[PDB]
Design a protein around this ligand. Structure first.
Ligand code: BOV
Ligand code: BOV
Ligand code: CL
Ligand code: CL
Ligand code: NI
Ligand code: NI
Ligand code: NI
Ligand code: NI
Ligand code: NI
Lengths: 306, 306
């Protein structure tokens, strides 16, 4: 019982975090085998980031210019190469703490844990969703660049995010570990605007199923709705349209609780139209959209990681 | 920018989790140096658990009765003793991954990270506060017994909680690492009521400072208040009394934002009297009370752990 914003255990990722310094710029890198992955931003001076020619700037950089520190040990850089917005520093030592890992590009509406780091040391861990507008609502300060987002499945770390940018609205933007941004963002010292965001309907439904699993059932009503009638309400409240693919993904939670997906949609319609009337769901006064169906099953079934 | 429920990185604690089995009962243990700490519940069979005489049950146990597994390695138990509600199993091997550590008993309002575990393997990490009623709002399933709660200062892990019980309202009770329960609770199979809970006033004020640090300051009014006049209002909304110690603990945040503690108290007094009127603070429609003043500084200044 209980339902919390639950992060993956961070130890497998902690063992990969290093400090990268080039000239006056220090940020985080990810050390996997004999490669350190970091934001290519690290090579730039102030006047470089005007409209930086990374091909031209990197040609001028020595392996010797990169200072890479794994705790109290300097790692020697023996080669460098750029992949999109990520710099790959080849080092002379393979990280003995490298976990089984993959690089994955996640979809909007999926979640991941962030290990927020400064000077290659961890500050903390929290859960994030990739928003429909390809931002995340992170917690990041100066020097957080190169902090990563990840999921774990059994023993395998799937890295999905490397932190680069804060927008003026105070939300965050970054890349996958192939250095391709999520969304229409660039790695520049500029004020950049995100598209309009939307509420992740399938996740709100997942969280209402979590509430039912945890015995918070007051919002359940006797009403049912069609998918079309529900979507006419979704649109008005800036919720994403619920597809049959989403209904299919909620199958397992519907089967666990005995509440048909379109019956839960009727309860969500009532909450959108009428509000909560002073009540809370899983301790929240708002409808939560940063838990996936899989996040709910993970937490409610006690899935562990080896 | 941003403000998240942020846990400590869990790696140092992950390296201490083991499985303890006595007969048919399996739960989690904490392996520090050559001692494994676990709930004494592990020595109960069926129809021991409703009114166990733990002293009598432990007399009948041999060292070999305790199966302790650290991953796929079995640890040899060479002694056992009971301290309050915790079992101390002396093993013939010191844990090479033992961090610098202390055992501390925390006060209501203090927060900590929980590494929820099953069969000695971590499921996830989240933040909890010790509630005024000496419960915690965790996320725990069957077999979570012996999961621990902790803080990190620099490199020192302060363990403050070991999980034992779920209460009827779906909240949680457990002990310090000396085996003394927080609150009136006992390690027995019986429904045990938590006291009516209250709001942690010093933490709400800390979170209002986090809001101001993040440029969310709509709720700041042009008034001040005395500590007396504030408490007269607090006590009508099920808030904890604010003390001068609370005021001084909030001093650094007051210094950072230029808002005197008593001026912030006047803004909180107006939020209690008038409500939030559909407005949000740091993305919440409720006043959040599970961040301490140190939690806000750690997160907003990027404090790291080595
Ligand atoms: C890089 F080292 C780093 O840590 N960050 C993290 C930002 C800092 C504050 N909170 C964060 O998440 N990245 C940067 O500082 C970005 C560097 C670029 C070149 C990748 N810059 C920005 O995020 C940025 C610049 C800028 C601006 F010029 C105007 C408005 C907003 C803005 N954001
Ligand atoms: C012990 F191994 C363990 O994992 N748990 C964790 C509980 C399980 C469900 N969620 C949790 O947090 N502890 C127990 O199962 C407790 C064992 C005792 C004997 C120490 N029992 C309870 O937590 C319990 C028993 C009980 C009851 F009989 C009525 C109402 C509530 C209640 N909780
Ligand atoms: Cl006792
Ligand atoms: Cl106001
Ligand atoms: Ni439960
Ligand atoms: Ni040199
Ligand atoms: Ni900021
Ligand atoms: Ni004995
Ligand atoms: Ni044997």
């Amino acid at each position: 019982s209980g339902f919390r914003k639950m992060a993956f255990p961070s130890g497998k990722v902690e063992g990969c975090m290093v400090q990268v310094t080039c000239g006056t710029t220090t940020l985080n890198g990810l050390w996997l085998d004999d490669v350190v992955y970091c934001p290519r931003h690290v090579i730039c001076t102030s006047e470089d980031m005007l409209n930086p020619n990374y091909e031209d700037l990197l040609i001028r950089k020595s392996n010797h210019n990169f200072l890479v520190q794994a705790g109290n040990v300097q790692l020697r850089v023996i080669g460098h190469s750029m992949q999109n917005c990520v710099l790959k520093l080849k080092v002379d030592t393979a990280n003995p703490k490298t976990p089984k890992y993959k690089f994955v590009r996640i979809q909007p509406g999926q979640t991941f844990s962030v290990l927020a780091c400064y000077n290659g040391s961890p500050s903390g861990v929290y859960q994030c969703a990739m928003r429909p507008n390809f931002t995340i609502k992170g917690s990041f300060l100066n020097g957080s660049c190169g902090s990563v987002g990840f999921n774990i499945d059994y023993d395998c770390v799937s890295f999905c995010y490397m932190h680069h940018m804060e927008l003026p609205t105070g939300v965050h933007a970054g890349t996958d570990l192939e250095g391709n941004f999520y969304g229409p963002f660039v790695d520049r010292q500029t004020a950049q605007a995100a598209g309009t965001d939307t509420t992740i309907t399938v996740n709100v439904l997942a969280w209402l199923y979590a509430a039912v699993i945890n015995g918070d059932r007051w919002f359940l009503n006797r009403f049912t709705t069609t998918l079309n009638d529900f979507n006419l309400v979704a649109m008005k409240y800036n919720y994403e349209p619920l597809t049959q693919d989403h209904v299919d993904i909620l199958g397992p939670l519907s089967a666990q609780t005995g509440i048909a997906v379109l019956d839960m949609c009727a309860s969500l319609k009532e909450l959108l139209q009428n509000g909560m009337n002073g009540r809370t769901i899983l301790g929240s006064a708002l409808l939560e959209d940063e838990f996936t169906p899989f996040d709910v099953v993970r937490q409610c079934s006690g899935v562990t990681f080896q």
